[PDB]
Write a protein that binds this ligand. Structure first.
Ligand SMILES: [Au+]
Ligand SMILES: [Au+]
Ligand SMILES: [Au+]
Length: 226
């Protein structure tokens, strides 16, 4: 079910949803994002690690979907999620991130997105800051992998994207905690689960999609950090 296109891998998850995967030698580390077809347009969640890889995402979209990319949202200011911002801006694609991601971007070595999302006290995106997001339902679960990490449900499907906050249920660790909030991580993981309570396919940055057990297993590992 995987399609190789250049050095990237694309996998269809639902009629209008694909997972994009790019690799960086750190051996090679995979990072996943999403592509969503919404009527006559395409929406992207996360860049690839690099500008060149992100340009290949746009090329794959042109070939396999052939609809314009209306916007991209990136889920925190680290290289695996935001390293390819320049390719999006070069193509004239409107980009969105948590306001905090944009504020942190220079210190993290990332190019800021063009637009900033803000959030209610319950974590839901303020809709005026998510214009024409279509099926993308953005939720800020609280600090976890980073203080700025956001998550995205795909309305009309069984899919929710946890980004780097959620690890699969076979994970032995919580990955890179160098920028993490170890106090609040567990509650943030549980908040993601409660925000998308009917999602059955959990997509994440560094594992293949998993069931909801990924959320609970992650939260229970994060319980041990306190
Ligand atoms: Au990260
Ligand atoms: Au950092
Ligand atoms: Au990551």
């Amino acid at each position: 079910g995987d399609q190789r296109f250049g050095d990237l891998v694309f996998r269809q998850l639902a009629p209008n949803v694909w997972q994009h995967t790019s690799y960086l030698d750190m051996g090679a580390v995979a990072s996943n994002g999403l592509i969503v077809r919404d009527g006559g347009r395409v929406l992207v969640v996360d860049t690839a690690w690099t500008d060149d890889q992100t340009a290949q995402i746009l090329n794959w979209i042109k070939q396999e979907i052939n609809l314009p990319v209306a916007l991209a949202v990136v889920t925190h200011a680290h290289q695996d999620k935001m390293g390819g911002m320049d390719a999006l801006h070069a193509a004239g694609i409107a980009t969105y991130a948590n306001a905090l991601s944009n504020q942190l971007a220079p210190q993290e070595g990332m190019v800021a997105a063009q637009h900033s999302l803000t959030f209610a006290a319950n974590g839901w995106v303020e809709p005026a800051t998510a214009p024409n997001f279509g099926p993308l339902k953005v939720f800020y679960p609280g600090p976890g992998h980073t203080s700025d990490n956001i998550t995205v449900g795909i309305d009309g499907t069984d899919i929710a994207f946890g980004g780097c906050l959620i690890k699969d249920s076979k994970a032995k660790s919580l990955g890179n905690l160098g920028d993490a909030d170890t106090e609040h991580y567990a509650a943030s993981a549980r908040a993601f689960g409660a925000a998308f309570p009917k999602a059955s396919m959990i997509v994440m940055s560094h594992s293949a999609p998993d069931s909801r057990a990924a959320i609970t297993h992650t939260a229970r590992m994060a319980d041990k950090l306190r």
